């Protein structure tokens, strides 16, 4: 069956299988989750330490695509870094032309359309990355968006990507994020990541966290290490 | 500043030009040849702004010889005239106008002798006799006076000598020597240079 | 074999088979009939709709390129509209250049040149549609056909679409050069009546006529009046 | 075979099977949309299915506003739908810029459909696997309903459906127009909801459906609130 | 037990399993079709020699040009496709003259070899220019010249890789000729000894008996410029052997 | 296996099979004929389209006028034929604009043949599946007949036929044609003879053929299409002559 | 496998499409060239008249310029294109450097063109090999050969096309300084060589000469008849 | 079979793996080994060079991009030369524009983008070369590796090329002491690490070793065959 070879093609039953094959790419990735609460959005990533040789604070999967928005990625890291460059360019162009910080919904739509361009044409493959975007602005509020390799974009109160998406999603489902505040949400994100991590298959992980919210005055930033250590100790204690 | 003269006849066309190429005041060359043979039986005489003359003449020469090599027969004089006129006229609108004034002389087996005239603006005109340059103003009346459509070639060289010695008498610039050649059915024939010491 | 798929590949025995396949696409299209009368030319085609829900006024299979030219098609609907827009544009370009209405022969030449332009490139497919282009110029009627191949022919009368062979036989039996268009429209609806496989009504068919006045699509009431016979 | 797998090549029967597969891609989504016209109103209804609780229900929508007085409902691939929606908005604004008046619904549908044609004729790109249904009010013609499909067919309609239950829904609607008495706004909305609910067997609640309307009184396209949808739904159940 | 599927060798820009990129390797195999060429670097100079492989007597011997002059300071010897060799020689010459124009100096042999190598690299098609051959250059060059560092001999291959080599052989009998080079060569040998040894090896590998006609020989010494041994000089040395 | 695709691959034994397959196409075409005479040159063709409901609106279906001084008849794909004739007319008028003289016949043929060669050589486009005859008068070589093929190769012929039964036409012309002795009337009679032999129809209909003649009258070329009455008279004369030859035996 | 694209090398590094074009050259009519001391003679066989064809249209030998001419064996249309391109290059070189083209310059240009068509896919090699003859400024005779691959080589004498192997073996045997001594002897040598492979002598050979400072002369059929008669009689 | 899905970079596999990129990642394994390690004050690159023959000189495995950055290559020398040219021009552009040395992290980001573009598009192959980038900047000493896949890492130490796992395990077990080492101790550690990769018969020599050092006071310098003898002499022997 030559239908799956290219994305220009359609299956006889109406399915573009290259895109689904690209969606299978992110499942290879280690998990990443983002939770939205009243104050803001918290992101977390389970960054597996492949070797002791690799420096800490390397292979970062949490990027800052503008001062007021952050990006968390799962799937091919090369494609993800390129998509982050695209998103940064889109945000800068929006600021330059329209004179203010890009709305997250619009940014998600533009990067999603850029992604969707690739599924159509035969010359170029779909992206191999699924990524989450999150921002807080006093006008818009807390917003969390996820973009699949297809270019589908939606807003999620809580979201997970990667290998352990389903388990992470049920754990997130039993949380009541809407009432909660960010400084608790970091602890619960750590708990969920420690739960879904598989010690047997994955040797070790270093929890990589970020948030954006009013506590930052609407700037996405990496967690202060004291708060990281507190959340990690809480997660280890709860794990039992 | 450069003189061209052409006299058509029953079975010939006579052409002559001054042999001076000059800087501001110094007459760098005394034996400059302003006649380019596009083919066996057609000559192109060119005067004008420096550089443009040789560039345009060489371009038309090589195009005509390419026509010869490709098709096995020479262009007609009228066709060569229209072709060089087209090339000059196209460049007039462009940023690189060739400021050149030309006289094309030819013999065709079917259509007989022909003399053609074109200015830098690329107008074309067949004529019995014609001249280019400031000396043309002095010498055209000589031709208009003594020319006959049935002029013999000895009479034509005599008439040309009269026209040129008038330049010697009156024209401010010094055009001491002139080159002369005839086109006929046989082909281009060089003639002795009319030299006024 | 490989000749089947490529459009820039002559098959053995010298056939551009993708074009033949496009003509097969034309043959599947709905019946269309064209009859050139002495004082006019009638273009007719069936506009059979899948359901009552369809609004007939929304789209038309018979379109005017100019005041005095109109055409009808059998084949692919989208391709028809691409070339009808291009035909209108070509006619307007002619009017800008020459300040005269374009002759029908010239228009069919230009649109056939477009259709040929598409066949050469591999990246594109041929237009899966054929046209009957009718016009009145110089106090004379005209009817033409232009195929996906980029070729054009001049027909006194012809049919395209389903059962086009049988319709053409019915026409050559029924055709008389002396016919006036009042009779020719009747003959055209009969030619279509051969091949409907349904009870034709004013909605189910679309028909248009050209004459000294120019091209027009006669209304549903008009075609009802003609259908009454 | 090999006559499929490229849009350009024709079958030996001249069918272009790839676009026909794009038509199947619409049904692969598992959602249905219905549009029905009225004497003074046009409505669009479609299923709204939220796979996960975590998804923000506000963000997920198949109803989009091409311009102030035109609304659309897209059925098929979500990404291709959003792209076609963006192209439609650009076409509408560009029409307003060039020609000085709001684009007609028919011309918008025609522009989008001929774009779909350039897709189905050029090799490298694929037809967008989505279907559009546009509703608006034209002053001359009153309400309008139109549909684009991946092929480039753009015909107007009295009423239509798209998605998996299209044949059942158009069978239902065909009966209702055949017993034509009229459709006021309430009856129009009721007909749409009854068609969708009957063909799906859903017996909807207000969250499960999203409805958008245009009316000659208020020409602007508006997406009704859950309260308005429940008001219409309760009226259906009561009678 | 034979597995001959290859199925990845066709088409450059395809990494086969184990990542070997076989089109370039086949191009490197291609130079073995060419006539054997041989280079020896010495303190007194660098010498280049090649077997002409004359097909017929009527062909003019001078026309075969498998050793050429990039400039006075550098010469080249080539084995492989004559046409793409001519292309690379043209690139070398224009780059040398561009260097003279811009910096009023003479290029080093390493720099010239790098210049041609950059052109050879362009088979990858990273550049968008249409006028670059998609196939790798099916030729190997030996660049011999006296520079600021003295006599130098550089080898270039279809990949575009280049290295200095005290002595190298390219072409059909490069295998075996290189073993003979390895045994005979010592760094101290004078250019006379190098010429004699290279001609011995060429006589061994060549199918036809060696004659002044069927070989081309050249040397560039620090005092001299690139020089080709004439018929008489070739006669003298091939007699001396 | 397959070295017949893409028109840019030399097959082993060095043959371009796409152009040969294109040359196969012209054989299907309606026969076209050209004969050279001392006083003129003619083109005669069989109107393969003999559908009852076709109108003869045009100057000619097969015969085209390219210039004041020449014409052509085409056998092959009609769309490529239309393209080639448009290109020919543009080439002729470009030469007239440049040199203010009529295009030489051989030069025009050579230019179009250069186009046809170019389409062979480059990858994407197909070769032109057309072969067409050129007839013209030029001051240099007088009346001339030229043939071209899809390959882009042309030649000068005293008389030749292209299309269906071209071999039979050439065999008949070889015996019949008298070098240096033809006149336009005799050449017309020969054309009717060879057309009757080649064409499957027992009687040449006089609506199933189109004949055009090129002659120089009063120093100006005239390209004329023989009208239906003229060709009717010609076929009547040929039938009478052939029957009388039959009657004697 | 490896014979469908020009770009792809084969295992063992053979580019096979160019070899196939070189094979295509072999199909063509024979051509022969020989360098006399003061003449260069270029001879080409003629396939057949066909009795309804005009011989003037078909001419294998052609003059690129006043001092250079070529003959070809291979695809006729490709030969026509290459001849025209070389002619325009000749006139352009005269335009650029105010000097007549050298034979090695023009054969280099033609070879570079053929090479340019080989290197890139999407273009097929010119299926021709050519024999270029001219006299240089010094007056030395020059004969060069080119092939679809794009290599060029000087030859004292050579043949191309069908029967090239046989006729070149004959020419390797026959050619010597003695034969080149006389212009008539050079013409007779090439005529005998073409007679080695041709159906009939006078009818089926078209021959031409270039002298030291004269234009190309295609020998008349009567002159060719006289020369073959002299050759025939001596046997 | 699954010979399909391997032909081009633009084809995803049924399990979400682009096989051509992995086949390119195999290319680094082909090349001779390289090792890089850093201290608080210095960054080091050391390499094992290979020679075609005894007469031939050893290949150049360490290349200087700028005073503050230099690279060592494992994999295709062609791609190495091209990427080195790109990096050199980027650094020159930074110095011309801003009059500051380019940050090494930003340079490897640029390399990653340039390398990523081939993988996604049809046409140019993935750059089948793996580079170790080492430099000193204001933040401190840095070592990065870049794969034929455009992903890049920041490393305390790393080894790429054939038989590099032995060097990696030596480096990992000895890593703690590296940070406080002198440059002599550090280069000696790296030399032993690459000595692990060599065959047992082979041993380190002046010829086949190249060392590249950069630091706060030291611009990038490649210590060649003669100059490596001070660093090599300290090493004791094979274990």
mmCIF file of C-alpha atoms in Angstrom, chain A residues 155-159 166 168-178, chain D residues 49-58:
data_model
loop_
_atom_site.group_PDB
_atom_site.id
_atom_site.type_symbol
_atom_site.label_atom_id
_atom_site.label_comp_id
_atom_site.label_asym_id
_atom_site.label_seq_id
_atom_site.Cartn_x
_atom_site.Cartn_y
_atom_site.Cartn_z
ATOM 1 C CA UNK A 155 -7.286 25.393 24.690
ATOM 2 C CA UNK A 156 -6.804 23.012 27.595
ATOM 3 C CA UNK A 157 -7.417 23.545 31.284
ATOM 4 C CA UNK A 158 -4.845 20.798 31.698
ATOM 5 C CA UNK A 159 -2.766 19.050 29.091
ATOM 6 C CA UNK A 166 -3.024 9.088 29.167
ATOM 7 C CA UNK A 168 -0.818 11.978 33.159
ATOM 8 C CA UNK A 169 -4.235 13.067 31.900
ATOM 9 C CA UNK A 170 -6.194 11.041 34.449
ATOM 10 C CA UNK A 171 -3.907 12.269 37.245
ATOM 11 C CA UNK A 172 -4.437 15.846 36.029
ATOM 12 C CA UNK A 173 -8.175 15.189 35.751
ATOM 13 C CA UNK A 174 -8.391 14.482 39.487
ATOM 14 C CA UNK A 175 -6.986 17.903 40.464
ATOM 15 C CA UNK A 176 -9.541 20.791 40.284
ATOM 16 C CA UNK A 177 -7.042 23.228 38.774
ATOM 17 C CA UNK A 178 -9.540 26.085 38.355
ATOM 18 C CA UNK D 49 -18.031 16.637 20.986
ATOM 19 C CA UNK D 50 -15.413 17.258 23.674
ATOM 20 C CA UNK D 51 -13.213 14.124 23.920
ATOM 21 C CA UNK D 52 -11.589 15.150 27.223
ATOM 22 C CA UNK D 53 -12.907 17.070 30.209
ATOM 23 C CA UNK D 54 -9.652 19.030 30.342
ATOM 24 C CA UNK D 55 -10.312 20.642 26.964
ATOM 25 C CA UNK D 56 -11.678 24.159 27.202
ATOM 26 C CA UNK D 57 -15.149 23.875 25.693
ATOM 27 C CA UNK D 58 -15.056 27.500 24.530
#
